[PDB]
Design a protein around this ligand. Structure first.
Ligand SMILES: Nc1ncnc2c1ncn2[C@@H]1O[C@H](COP(=O)(O)OP(=O)(O)O)[C@@H](O)[C@H]1O
Lengths: 307, 43, 126, 65
């Protein structure tokens, strides 16, 4: 896939769009639309602020204009951002019939009245707090493009969303997230299997035999720190597009991270020593975190008054 | 049905204008909502 | 207790918690990023991650960092937004040789894991 | 006891005025109505002298003192 895509990418036109894309957003759109044309799902891992939402909107516009892909498109985004995605779609590409599926039982019942009709809607906007329990109506649907904003909510396959959204009948799948990692390497597997099941058909054990060695590279355990990381990159190369804002919009100021550590007050020292010399490791860690923050979290100093 | 390859690309104009008007009204509502409404008249 | 401490020293502030309404959150954001008098903007680390725009500040002080990363980053990105006019200094407080030391270490480890995993030049060039 | 203290004005109004003589304390946490047990240790002479020299709030008997 990597080689034949590089061959394919040895430039499209942003047709049917109100605004204009930036030089890098146009390149990302080109990459992901070539991915589509090659019948491949991908992850747009552009860092926050780069505007992957506008990139996906322009991608949908191009699919509808050039390829005539006007069929139903499902965009699943967190509830706090549904309004944002709707406003973006309306400001950048108002041509699409937008169905903002949200509300209570009756409101959603009404909004689904007649949605089975062709051309009734072009882009459907919903949220995880909703599709999670209304999957019975969305599962049996012929979606063309499945878009998930802030895919980090699908970080793990034990959260009832990964399963709820896995078997969603769709032709193409797109994941938008700025942090596919920094909880574990298994989140990448949860995101990719949802993206390319037949490629990662092997259960989580296969990528666990990839992470466990890789995790040791940071710790004392065997520290190859080479070869296996390049193999992981090769595996992830044709699927995800990653860009950092420090170079795309380098005009931003610099940020410095300073770490300072202090001693523990006697009132903190005594409580910490007591909890240490005490339940479970989790409860002990929680109590210690509570102590490190402030001892009043347990019991403030008692106000005294006559008897 | 199944014959709107171009009819859809022509009718899209009306929906585009409608959504444009709707989003402009949304922006106008937000703008008028952003006001402060402060009046210290010093009786 | 953080507000109880800040008051003893006399520092303006506008707290922000998950219990606050999105309307109140947006109002506090707009009033803070506009009014220069407020010196502090106490908020939770794992609160609303998107929509937050606090460019009005120029420094960050992480009191209780989380074991896992990517959320302190989302927190740092609340002040390190595009259009920031001044450099952002992120201060991290750790109570010595405690569970906090462990959390910091683990955070660093996870960051290294993520950096070596995804930052391997996954651009459109290759 | 009936004693009511003044910890200060609410903390949210710190931005109201530019500078004021009032002190600002964070909105008290917990339920408005809360109880708690106090394990006090005193002596009998304390009760003796309290019943021999009474005290209270808003009572003119304090003139005795
Ligand atoms: N090419 C562009 N022209 C105008 N505005 C843009 C452009 N790219 C991004 N933006 C702005 O960036 C903001 C971020 O949008 P969005 O992509 O939803 O956030 P995120 O960066 O978290 O994905 C939008 O409000 C949008 O106005």
């Amino acid at each position: 896939y990597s080689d034949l895509l590089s061959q394919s990418l040895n430039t499209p036109i942003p047709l049917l769009l109100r605004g204009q894309l930036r030089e890098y957003q146009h390149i990302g759109l080109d990459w992901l639309v070539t991915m589509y044309e090659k019948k491949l799902n991908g992850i747009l891992a552009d860092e926050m602020g780069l505007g992957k939402t506008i990139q996906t909107i322009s991608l949908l516009a191009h699919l509808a204009c050039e390829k005539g892909n006007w069929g139903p498109h499902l965009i699943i985004v967190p509830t706090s951002v549904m309004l944002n995605w709707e406003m973006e779609l309306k400001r950048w590409c108002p041509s699409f019939k937008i169905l903002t599926y949200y509300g209570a039982q009756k409101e959603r019942k009404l909004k689904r009245q007649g949605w089975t009709k062709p051309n009734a809607f072009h882009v459907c906007i919903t949220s995880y707090k909703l599709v999670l329990q209304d999957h019975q109506a969305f599962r049996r649907k012929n979606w063309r493009y499945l878009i998930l904003d802030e895919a980090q909510n699908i970080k793990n396959f034990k959260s009832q969303r990964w399963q709820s959204l896995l078997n969603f009948n769709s032709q193409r799948r797109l994941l938008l997230t700025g942090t596919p990692l920094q909880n574990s390497l298994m989140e990448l597997w949860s995101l990719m299997h949802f993206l390319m099941p037949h490629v990662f058909q092997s259960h989580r054990e296969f990528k666990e035999w990839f992470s466990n060695p890789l995790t040791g590279m940071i710790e004392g355990s065997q520290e190859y720190n080479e070869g296996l990381v390049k193999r992981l990159h090769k595996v992830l190369r044709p699927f995800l597009l990653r860009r950092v804002k420090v170079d795309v919009e380098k005009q931003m100021p610099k940020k410095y991270e300073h770490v300072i550590r202090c001693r523990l007050s006697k009132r903190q020292r005594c409580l910490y020593d007591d909890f240490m010399a005490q339940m479970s490791v989790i409860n002990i860690l929680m109590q210690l975190r509570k102590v490190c923050n402030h001892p009043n979290l347990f019991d403030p100093r008692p106000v005294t008054s006559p008897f | 049905p199944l014959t709107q390859e171009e009819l859809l690309r022509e009718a899209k104009i009306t929906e585009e204008l409608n959504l444009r008007s709707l989003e402009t009204y949304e922006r106008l509502e937000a703008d008028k909502k952003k006001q402060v409404h402060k009046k210290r008249k010093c009786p | 207790v953080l507000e109880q401490f800040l008051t003893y020293h006399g520092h303006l502030y506008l707290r922000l918690d998950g219990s606050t309404r999105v309307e109140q959150r947006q109002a506090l954001m707009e009033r803070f990023n506009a009014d220069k008098r407020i010196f502090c903007f106490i908020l939770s680390t794992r609160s609303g991650g998107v929509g937050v725009n606090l460019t009005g500040a120029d420094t960050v002080v992480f009191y209780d960092s989380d074991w896992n990363p990517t959320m302190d980053a989302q927190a740092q990105d609340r002040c390190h937004r595009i259009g920031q006019t001044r450099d952002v200094h992120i201060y991290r407080l750790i109570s010595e040789r405690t569970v906090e030391e462990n959390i910091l270490k683990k955070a660093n480890q996870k960051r290294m894991l993520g950096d070596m995993a995804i930052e391997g030049g996954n651009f459109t060039t290759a | 006891s009936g004693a009511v203290k003044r910890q200060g004005r609410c903390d949210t109004y710190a931005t109201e005025f530019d500078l004021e003589a009032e002190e600002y304390v964070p909105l008290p946490k917990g339920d408005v109505h809360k109880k708690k047990e106090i394990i006090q240790d005193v002596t009998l002479h304390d009760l003796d002298v309290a019943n021999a020299r009474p005290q209270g709030g808003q009572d003119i008997l304090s003139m005795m003192g």
